[PDB]
Assembly symmetry: C2
Homo-oligomer: 360 residues x 2
Amino acid sequence: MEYQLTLNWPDFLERHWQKRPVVLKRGFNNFIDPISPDELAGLAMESEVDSRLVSHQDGKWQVSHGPFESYDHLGETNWSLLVQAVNHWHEPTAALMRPFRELPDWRIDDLMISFSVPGGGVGPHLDQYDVFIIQGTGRRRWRVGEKLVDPFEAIIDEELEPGDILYIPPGFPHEGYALENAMNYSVGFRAPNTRELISGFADYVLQRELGGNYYSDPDVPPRAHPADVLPQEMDKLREMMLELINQPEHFKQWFGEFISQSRHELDIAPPEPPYQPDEIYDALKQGEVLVRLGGLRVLRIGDDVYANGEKIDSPHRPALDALASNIALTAENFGDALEDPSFLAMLAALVNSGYWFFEG
Amino acid sequence: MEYQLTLNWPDFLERHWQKRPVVLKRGFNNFIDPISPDELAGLAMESEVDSRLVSHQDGKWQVSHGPFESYDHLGETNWSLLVQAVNHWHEPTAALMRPFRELPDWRIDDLMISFSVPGGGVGPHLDQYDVFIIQGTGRRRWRVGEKLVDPFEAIIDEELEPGDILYIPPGFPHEGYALENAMNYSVGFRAPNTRELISGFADYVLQRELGGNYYSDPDVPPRAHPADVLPQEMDKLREMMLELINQPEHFKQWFGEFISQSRHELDIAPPEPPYQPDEIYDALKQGEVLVRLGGLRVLRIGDDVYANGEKIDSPHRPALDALASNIALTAENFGDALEDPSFLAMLAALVNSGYWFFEG
């Protein structure tokens, strides 16, 4: 069961992406929910799952953090259950993100799911990330205001029916609540800020013991006061910093290892006993399907491939492209790379880490 | 008791600084040691003082780390006591660094002192910093080889007598040992490497919550494979990093707070009871002398002054210049800045921190 978007992509990218919110009426035709509210509540009982219950009664709000060992007496209205990274824990839910691969993988994040009884919601919110809010079963009133959380005048005020999608760029205040029992599936995106880049790269430089070159001044300039630090010296320091940043491969490597990690916990379960390369080879040749873990980020930067922060280095370009793009793999995809024991051993390592697994 | 260098500074800067080692014969005329070996050993008994005892017997070496509660049975030859930052703990020793203020304050570090019986030394060493090794009482054989620690062929091999100075640039392997009971005073310099700059600045950005601007891509480029991260996106990230670094005042401030701290512990003793501004004012007007703490780093960057990592902000330029250059201050230096209660309060704060103190 896959999903087909009806959206006009060039139009959307030109007119809306990172620009202006919009409601995509019937973005999915005959939308069938990939998960039931019962199953969603089943996920929210688990220790490793990010979930919260938001209620509101006579003005004030109430956030309870999961896991929940009970939903006994909750009420018939004005509450909502939210679960993060459901794609990490539920394959059919992970299927929802496939049609959004018109946008790059490195920018996409995870699938958030909210169930809400009538009047249920999280209240007025403003974010710094893009989001596609997919309406499942039920109906939801959504309001979005101008890019100015205090109350706002809406520029979009719509009731969402199954199949409808609400796209909201960063900065636009929005508020949604349920009219009838509703499921909302938020396909969220992520973008780093400069602070995170500079910190991550600094840590990378420190761990690898890079940038060990010292400031040198054989032409140390004269000054009126010995305590002064002249602008040109400052410029020299700055320039060696910027030059360290602009180094060709260190940057590609750091960012490759950085952007390939997930914000939320993955379902890591190493197979026991571990796979030998021969076993991988045999499984693939016999027709078995190699499946990527849900939420596992795999990105291609230059020649290398990066999966959950670790480098994947192989001369077999097509095989690595296949590994990076296909979440389900067969032997045909790898091609003659399987005859390379090195590559085979790397695949074996990745599988033993629990990043890929056969069938399920 | 001050010290007068006989060195030709333009010659030294042109021909030797960060370029080539040299022996400055009689750099100090009639050199009188600012500290006796007894006093030096007295310092090395204290908890807060960095000191080590290096011995060597029949090939192998032995490093003991201070403090030392005994020197009972040590031997008559082949050992050496080393103490770091003696200028932090001994004023007459701190006087030795004044004539080297032809080089900028921000590049200079601290005064290291070694006492050694005949045959005493630390063995062959290579450093990444500049150093002036001043020969006190006794004699020492020093050898310096080419900028290539394995043994080396020397290009300088000299016996140092009282008043002699051996300058060694970074990278030149050197080895010195005592012929008769010797005192050596190493005026050392420091230069940051790129790693330290990038880490410090990253931490500065994180603490102040700067660089909160996110990567935005309204013109998100097309790609063959959704997993790819295109060179231009990388360039955008890089560029926002470099742009954060090149921000005008944040850089000056971070570096100002960074380069003004000392590597070694300072002798911080806040006066009790704390000074009121009126008391500072009165003390200065009555003719008392305000003295900077030994090792306390004060540097001028643009308009601001930085002392031990903290910013000093005042419209009174001459007074702050005086504070930055003069280690001993009188009212005349501050001038009409003392009539400003704000400035007075700042001075009071700095004194209460233990950074400056009256007389002693």
